[PDB]
Amino acid sequence: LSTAILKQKNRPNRLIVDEAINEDNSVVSLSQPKMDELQLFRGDTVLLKGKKRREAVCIVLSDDTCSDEKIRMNRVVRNNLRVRLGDVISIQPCPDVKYGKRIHVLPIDDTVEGITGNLFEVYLKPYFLEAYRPIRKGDIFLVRGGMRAVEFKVVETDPSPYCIVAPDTVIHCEGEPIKREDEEESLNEVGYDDIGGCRKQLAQIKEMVELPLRHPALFKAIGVKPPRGILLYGPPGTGKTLIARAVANETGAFFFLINGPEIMSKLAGESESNLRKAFEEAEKNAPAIIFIDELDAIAPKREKTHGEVERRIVSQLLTLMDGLKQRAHVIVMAATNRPNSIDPALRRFGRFDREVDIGIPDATGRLEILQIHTKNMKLADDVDLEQVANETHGHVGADLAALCSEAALQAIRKKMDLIDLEDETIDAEVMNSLAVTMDDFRWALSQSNPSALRETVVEVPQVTWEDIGGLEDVKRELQELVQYPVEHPDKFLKFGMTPSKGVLFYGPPGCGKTLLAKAIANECQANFISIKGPELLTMANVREIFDKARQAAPCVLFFDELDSIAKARGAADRVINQILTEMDGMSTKKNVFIIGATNRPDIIDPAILRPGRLDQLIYIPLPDEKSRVAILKANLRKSPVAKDVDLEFLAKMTNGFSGADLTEICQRACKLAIRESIESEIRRERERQPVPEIRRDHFEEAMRFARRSVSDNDIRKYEMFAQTLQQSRGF
Amino acid sequence: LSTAILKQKNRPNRLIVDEAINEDNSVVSLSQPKMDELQLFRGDTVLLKGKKRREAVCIVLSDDTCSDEKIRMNRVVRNNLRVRLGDVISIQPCPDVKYGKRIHVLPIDDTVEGITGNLFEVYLKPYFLEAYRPIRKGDIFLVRGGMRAVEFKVVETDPSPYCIVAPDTVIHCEGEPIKREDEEESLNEVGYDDIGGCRKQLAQIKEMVELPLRHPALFKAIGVKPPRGILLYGPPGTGKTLIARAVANETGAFFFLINGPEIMSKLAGESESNLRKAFEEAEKNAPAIIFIDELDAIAPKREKTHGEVERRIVSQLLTLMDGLKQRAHVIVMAATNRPNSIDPALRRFGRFDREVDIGIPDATGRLEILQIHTKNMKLADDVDLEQVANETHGHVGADLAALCSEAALQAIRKKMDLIDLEDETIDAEVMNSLAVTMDDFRWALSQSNPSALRETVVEVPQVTWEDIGGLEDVKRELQELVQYPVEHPDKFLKFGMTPSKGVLFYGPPGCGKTLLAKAIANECQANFISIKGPELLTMANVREIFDKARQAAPCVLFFDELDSIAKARGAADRVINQILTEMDGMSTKKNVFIIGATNRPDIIDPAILRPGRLDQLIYIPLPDEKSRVAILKANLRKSPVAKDVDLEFLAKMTNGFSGADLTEICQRACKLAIRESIESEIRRERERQPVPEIRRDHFEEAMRFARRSVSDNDIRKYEMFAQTLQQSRGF
Ligand SMILES: Nc1ncnc2c1ncn2[C@@H]1O[C@H](COP(=O)(O)OP(=O)(O)OP(O)(O)=S)[C@@H](O)[C@H]1O
Ligand SMILES: Nc1ncnc2c1ncn2[C@@H]1O[C@H](COP(=O)(O)OP(=O)(O)OP(O)(O)=S)[C@@H](O)[C@H]1O
Ligand SMILES: Nc1ncnc2c1ncn2[C@@H]1O[C@H](COP(=O)(O)OP(=O)(O)OP(O)(O)=S)[C@@H](O)[C@H]1O
Ligand SMILES: Nc1ncnc2c1ncn2[C@@H]1O[C@H](COP(=O)(O)OP(=O)(O)OP(O)(O)=S)[C@@H](O)[C@H]1O
Ligand SMILES: [Mg+2]
Ligand SMILES: [Mg+2]
Ligand SMILES: [Mg+2]
Ligand SMILES: [Mg+2]
Structure with a gap:
């Protein structure tokens, strides 16, 4: 596993903290069988190892009421180790303890x-x-x-x-x-428990940094050289500096911190002196970490740089990086939120060659962040952090810290009628009563502008096969194209076939191409990257998309709305030729799948369809009657539909409707129900000063306004391309 | 031969190391006939020359059990010479050895x-x-x-x-x-045995560097001046610095190393002082090598440079290069991974005029690199380095060193359940058992992102004539066009004909144009450069392609998918006119063959077809029945096809199919076989909690879904251009 280093060793020396009975600050109690296994005696002074390198020396005693797997200590011992109830410590004999002078x-x-x-x-x-x-x-x-x-x-x-x-x-x-x-x-102090949503990345950092430093013989024995330079990168606010402080406070190595702005705020000559001194002092202390935070502050691209001092800093840093003897036991970490602004000479073999990507957290990762930030806030009992984690889509760790700050401020605003800004001291009965409710979090959500909204999200979609109606054959094809080469690669080696990594969805608009791409990425549990045509035409950067899909393999790289690029053919010609070049170089990665979708198959570039790029042409057609029943059922799963509504009849009378037309019919029915419900409560308020489910009448009214989004001539042309799209290349 | 300098002289002074019998650290045993030839006596002190200039003095004795061609020594002597069993040493009499003071x-x-x-x-x-x-x-x-x-x-x-x-x-x-x-x-220390995949380039370096320095009289006698400046260039990580250390540790000359970043990290004035001092100290020691590593760090283009100090360094270096008297016996080597970023004045006659290209290693070259890196790793017995060498397509030496590091790390991850990160010392029973298995190498392969994926590969293709079905006439034409002028140039001088260096493949899509170009480059054992149309339209750089094909002659320069450029006619107009200009200047090289392929012959630029550019128009047609049998046989060579499958019948019923359509039919049959096999094992697992070969049923099911990729009207138009393409220029 990739996270095996983070796993607890579960050694007998590991113990769980318990609530003390009579044990004071200087004693700890254990079960007698535990000392029998540990060969510990009575009156022995013992050393406790906890979080953030904190230590304590206490006396071990025998408790007949102590569990085998747990240790007894008071709140003072629990405090001195930075441990809490339910957390694990370690125990070892402590000899050679002499009398204090x-x-x-x-x-x-x-x-x-x-x-x-x-x-x-x-x-x-x-x-x-x-x-x-x-x-x-x-x-x-x-x-x-x-x-x-x-x-x-x-x-x-x-x-x-x-x-x-x-x-x-x-x-x-x-x-x-x-x-x-x-x-x-x-x-x-920050610890590894103050970082949320970075469990995989923390495992990488521990292997790259804490393993080569604690056990250099483990790498000399297996005959390999550990890396000397680690580059943390990610968007702003994702917690790279936080991981820096976590490593500073929870490593056995000497830690030197270099700040980019700190170095460059100095005069021309004190910057190089400070860099040299940092590396010298890191070499005097044998296992050491140099963290250069904001690397791109001190080391931008030498080709894009005007001052002489900036270029001398980059050369000084390259010299110092190369001057690490690999026997000095010095590892240089760096953080940057512009990894492409860094001098390319600093990302070579022997200098920052390993990179960790502290990316955007997903819904569960950012729920973990929210729990870390609210862990000392006074939350009400109705606050649902799981929900807040679901709406906070484009948020990073710093956006969620800001969101919790705004929620607390809204809670204070609800209590300003009880306090004054000019009091010499605040009231005491309003502090203990001051709690952040879920309403304050909804308000803070409505006001938060995330900083990570406009950047590519790489995550497993929540769209499931159950969200899609019909297309059972297409689901089988997609499974055999995306899942089999990933799940059963030995089968593909047996028959000597190589799998095709490209699919083109085409057909009438609104028939489920985007849903199919997300659903297959969800079933395969693969990361999903979606790049709509408009995003490409408003963009060097196609290369970053394919690199991003390569790092996140197994990935489904979806190119949605290819018809928008096709209609623009310029900038669109460069984009398509870049995509084609990337798909040619992408064939090496056997687990990145590329999918394109278009509802203008008549203008797709024929080179897209060349055997080896997107040669699997799957035609998603306009749904038939059975599929229309399935679409209507799929759209109404989250809605309270009354039982008298006949989806079979609804699908019978909608003939040439897309999946999106049926969704629009269900949307209209919900709108009529909402209007009737709103009118009902206004009428009740009018008399004082109902509509629990969507009924058959709402669907009748909503359906007489149904508009068919695909023409009959459109259906004819789409059916024609269902037979002659592979022939589009050649003339 | 180009590698004659690397050949072993096979002199009698050369001996093979053997396992000692009774010989201690200070004696070496030889066969008595060997001393008779060498006129060596008993008790003589002798000097041994080994690898990396290491020396030893020992006593030669007589062994009646020693082979003629081998020498006897213990492991201590083998260690002191940096030699191993099976390696060759040299022996010579050592007189004038006096008593130690x-x-x-x-x-x-x-x-x-x-x-x-x-x-x-x-x-x-x-x-x-x-x-x-x-x-x-x-x-x-x-x-x-x-x-x-x-x-x-x-x-x-x-x-x-x-x-x-x-x-x-x-x-x-x-x-x-x-x-x-x-x-x-x-x-x-690095030696010439620590570089893999650079045998040809190491021979160049030895001739250019070690020959003019060891034997300057050999060049004065033949009346020529040896070069003074050698520029190693290549992509990052290809081993230019490694060759620098190899020459540093295995040359008899004084070696001075200059680092680009080292020089430019100094103040304005200490850089020029350090450059002057380096050249002065190289002239004091008569045969000397100055290596300027990262040349482009200190000598960028003076036209593209802002600081005054950078321009003064370049002028200082030009002065020092010109100041070499050619009687000083000083050779200046330089390395750079941006050879076009260097000031053009530094690549002139008398300054870095000789260039060695340390390019991307090929499959056998990178197998040699992998053996060098794993030679001290603890490999399992199931690891197949030949296979790893085959999948590592875009890897350079540093990418393979990183790949072996990641494989070792995966091996450690499999053993973290036995070790702890907080142990004062590691366990001893896990080191000896720690070995890197082929599974760890497959995992490291899946995670490696090569740095040389997006750059032109120049290598002999593995596509063979046996990979192609039919086209026997086209194979004869291609042999008479590409092989005869290279293999029998005297025939072409006898008849006074000059050969034509250009061919245009045209015809329906999927009929084998790309395969034919690769197959002829493979048969002629010529380097192959492929430039697809999309790669050109996403690109000064056409000039580099033709220069690259000129350096790698005999080369086949393939311009695939010319139809993509034709449809873009702008940027496409500049690209075509650049290609035409290059093909006009390319006629000098009699052994670079240019091939173009297009399946839109109706829009090809007529100037392409001018006698002297691509005037050989070969029409690859849609395969006939006999060729379709041959295509199906060629595609199924790597597949286990059951004997009841009638390829004759398959080719009979597929009439207007391309080669790629038949490949798609075979792909579908393999997909049905894989689906049936996967369903069979799931059924077995279902009952507990088959399909060894593709059968005739799979080909029946796969063929009823066969879609013909070339229309009948398309076939008509292609047949029309088979007669009137040479007439396309004129109106
Ligand atoms: N993954 C995370 N887990 C917990 N808290 C986080 C996380 N990421 C960010 N935070 C919080 O957000 C604050 C700011 O994060 P930083 O560590 O400054 O991120 P950053 O990588 O430094 O972004 P920069 O410096 O602007 S490039 C931290 O102090 C935490 O309070
Ligand atoms: N087969 C289907 N099953 C269920 N819902 C569907 C189906 N087809 C379309 N929809 C709904 O209609 C919306 C249209 O999105 P998609 O059809 O997946 O994308 P599309 O095929 O590219 O059509 P567009 O985006 O309108 S051009 C979906 O978000 C669903 O809400
Ligand atoms: N041809 C090779 N044979 C063996 N090992 C190699 C080879 N090329 C690279 N390596 C290994 O990869 C490491 C990196 O090689 P370098 O010497 O840094 O290459 P490079 O040409 O200096 O690239 P730069 O300096 O970034 S332009 C070497 O130290 C070797 O361990
Ligand atoms: N004559 C043939 N013999 C064997 N395999 C063939 C033949 N023609 C095509 N193929 C197969 O179909 C694929 C198509 O590649 P090529 O035909 O060489 O390229 P092409 O002629 O330029 O047509 P494209 O690439 O589809 S535009 C090949 O990689 C083979 O797998
Ligand atoms: Mg920061
Ligand atoms: Mg869509
Ligand atoms: Mg180098
Ligand atoms: Mg081709």
Whole structure:
């Protein structure tokens, strides 16, 4: 699997956190059989490994009420490891823990507000009375005393980082008290759990970055060289910088961060000095990561660049990238939202040759993002994040963070009648009551302008075969053309046939060509890329479409509305010839399928049909009576149709209708039902100051206005091309 | 021959390595007749020359069990020469070897891990006890002693580089111990054996570079001046830098390396200083090579350049190139992947006038690359590198190195369930078991995006006359037009006729024009360049195509789908007029053949047909019955067709079918067989929870759906142009 690196090892050292019974900050309880397997004894000091490299040293005890697979700890231990209930930790024996020489501690500010008592005497001394509590640098623990308990932070240890607080150890609380904001900033460090919708890409990053650095011998043994340069790219706001901070906070390697604007804001000469210093300091620390965020800020195309300093930065960076000895254990990551603006010399072998695409999240990916962002918001109980994830079509992670911000602001606007902008301090009874409801999310949805609306979406469609009425033969052909070479490639090797990767749908308008392309991509669970003819004529970029379909294989590359390009024949001639050239180079990829659709088969370019490009000509015809019943059933699945409606009769009397004409009939019936329902409630309001389902009368009224969208002469010509389209090339 | 310089001289001094019997690190055994021919005696110290200029001094002995053509040595001697079993060395008498004054040695780190004993006393003294072992600087030898033997490196010799370790010689092991990584980096130096698919180009480089430098008198005697500038060019990743390191590590000349980005990363003034210093230091060392890697980094087109410093670098380089006295014995090599971005003044006589094209490797060349890269990988036994070489179509050497990396990573992913990313050290039982299987290579193939897919391939096609059915007369014409002027030029001089270098294939679509062009290029063993019409209309660059066909002569330059250009008549007018101009200038090359194909002969530009451009008009017609049998046989060669299938009957009932229509019939039959086979196995799985060959029923079902791709009126018009196409020019 591609995500095997992210899988939990499920070792016995892994344990699940539980709610403590009597265990204080410095002890943890386990089941006795667990120590028997782990050979742990009583009174042993143990080391806990958690999230974001956080550590803790505590005492392991025996619990007869502890589960085998779980560990016992209080909320303080759960806090110090950045772990939560239900999360997994690791445990290992901790030897060589010596008595503390001197521990430097300090309290949290908001705990010692208004308190003038001696912190050491009143709080620290009783808590450290012969208990032999093991502590580590950076730990936070709650100490009772006085009217209110105060938390303290271990800022320095003698020795570091583990020590035992003996009664002979010197405990001192001098120094500037620790602000809660300082600990709060460290509490909310980014981790791999703060990225949603990037599970596959996070697996790639771990293999490319964390594996060659933690286990360089694993690559020397298999006799391969790991990459030195990783280029994260994607649209703006998709979380490349967020992944940078996640790797910064959850890697064992030394991490150096370079900002593009930071480097180029410096004078001519301090930029190169800072670049050289970054790579030098990364080589001094053996396993290191250099992240160059906004790579295209410092390394644009040398052909398209005016200043001398910009060109000297790019050459300096190329030199430093080439100067990595491959024995230095330095990996250079970079992020960019304009991957094609980067100097081509920086994307070669040995320099940023591996690329990770942090693309647009899909509906489930962006539901995961929404849960991450709302995880600390005060949500109401009626808010359905699954729904919000479904309407947020063109949103990226930053668009969803902005959407949650706007929802919170709408919630505040509903409470401004209770607050004032000029209060010295806000009311206390409005904070606890302040919650974001699903209505605020609907409002924020109506006002959000996504930044990723105008760019190609590559995802499995939700259109299913059940959305299509009839075309059972075409469904069989499409399965045998798109699914068999992908699912049973050995069959195609047995008979020596190579599969054809192209299909042309043609026929009258509104008969289901677009639905068929999406439905076959959905059944095969293949990514779907749709490029309408108008999008091509308003566009170098055809090359990016085919490259995008190559990266996302198995893919169905749909070229819809080819008739729009054909009518434009100029720019349309270049577009078609580019597409033909790409389809010739595309034959290598055995799992990218190209589909074209046109309802003007008389003007299609004959070269499109050459054996090897789109030689499978499938004719989607105007639906017959049985298919019309099926179309009407398929369109009305989401509608409450009353049982007296005879779809058999509706399909009998609509003779030359398309699938889209039948959809328009159902649309009119819903419009009549909505009008009747709206009139009914206005009449009720009129008297005070119904229409649950679409009935047969609505379909009668809607159908006497039915207009047939394909002429009889049109049907004749389409039937003629059903026989003579393969002959269109030649004369 | 063009590769005569690479041929082994097969001198008596050449010997084949053998597995030692009793020979230790300082002795080598030979057959007694070999010394009789070589006049070598017993106890003589001898010098061994191996790969990458490595040397060794040892003692020659007499072996009655040694072959005449082979030499005896242990693994230590085999290691010190960078030679392997089956490889050839050279031998010569070594006189004037004096006693050592002081030899500075040091051990390898991993050999002395955990060992605190005295290296000299325990190891070095017993091994050097009166044995009079001859040693050289940089030698590595294994010395027994203690619980574990330790290897030592000779870092300095008094005198250098040969010395005799007398008992009176001072042996000392002080100094920082030698890391194995340091020796490992020197072990894996690049040599001419680390380049695959460039045998012809390596021969060119040796003649242009290593011959004028080793034997300048050989050029003064024949009265010619050797070139001073060699330009390696090719697509990115094709191994130009690799050849640079190979020449650096396997030439007797002083080698200076200049990096384009290195030079231009310096300040305005240190760049010119570094260039001048490089050429000065190359002239101080008499036979020298200056390699300027990434030439286009420092020397772009002065017309297309903005900075003043860039233009001063180009002028500085032109001055230095012109300043080579031709008596300095300095050769300047350069590499570039944009040979047309270089200043035209640098490709003139006396400056980079010789060019070597490190092009795309072909199937056998890239099999050689794959063997080089996997030679230290742990491959399984089922991996077929010949197959991988066949699917990797658009790959260059760097794409194949990346492909082997991805295969190794897939192998690791299959073993992550046994390893952990957080282990302090990896498991030992998973390394030895970790091997790359052919399944990992198929996966890496499915994910590889080659960088050389979108560029012209120049190679001999695999299409053979047996792939074509019928057209026996056309095959005779093509042989008499393409093969006779190449194979029997004296015949064409006898009769005073000059051959015509152009052919126009025309006729109905799908009748074999593309196959005929590839088949004649394959029979003549000529390079084949194909330029489809769409590729031209999406493109200065026509000039590069004809230049590329001129460099690769004997070549068949195929202009396929000329009908696509004709229908576009603009950009198409410029393309045709450019092609016509090139065909006029192309008549000089007597061994570049141009072929055009069109299935719209009614709109071909009449100037194409002028006597001297494409005046040979060959009409490929719609196949007759006998040819249809031949086409069906040719298409089904790779398919398991059952014997009851009557191809004679199939061809009888398909009357007006093209070659491509018959191929489509065979494709449908294979699709029906695949569907039946897939249904059969699903039925077997259905009952548990066949179709070995295509039978006559499949061809019956497939043929009732057969559609004829050429109309009867189309056939009439094509037959009319079979008589009146030469008349198309004039009115
Ligand atoms: N995949 C994601 N998961 C969770 N939060 C995300 C994700 N992507 C974006 N966000 C949020 O959006 C914010 C902005 O994302 P960034 O990390 O700046 O994206 P970006 O790749 O840097 O885009 P740029 O810098 O404009 S090219 C982050 O701080 C997160 O709060
Ligand atoms: N066979 C069908 N089954 C169900 N709904 C259909 C069918 N054909 C058309 N429709 C409906 O009519 C709409 C027309 O879209 P399609 O027919 O898939 O695209 P089309 O064939 O290119 O025709 P266009 O887009 O109007 S030119 C669909 O979105 C459906 O709502
Ligand atoms: N012909 C070849 N034989 C063997 N290995 C090769 C060959 N070509 C490339 N490689 C491998 O691929 C790597 C990349 O080759 P390079 O030397 O970078 O090619 P290149 O010509 O320098 O391309 P540039 O520098 O981007 S223009 C080499 O280090 C080898 O490991
Ligand atoms: N005479 C033939 N013998 C064998 N196979 C043939 C023959 N003619 C056509 N084919 C098959 O049909 C395919 C069509 O390719 P060609 O006929 O060589 O190209 P063409 O003549 O330019 O016609 P196109 O490419 O369809 S416009 C070939 O790749 C073969 O698979
Ligand atoms: Mg950013
Ligand atoms: Mg549509
Ligand atoms: Mg290079
Ligand atoms: Mg062809």
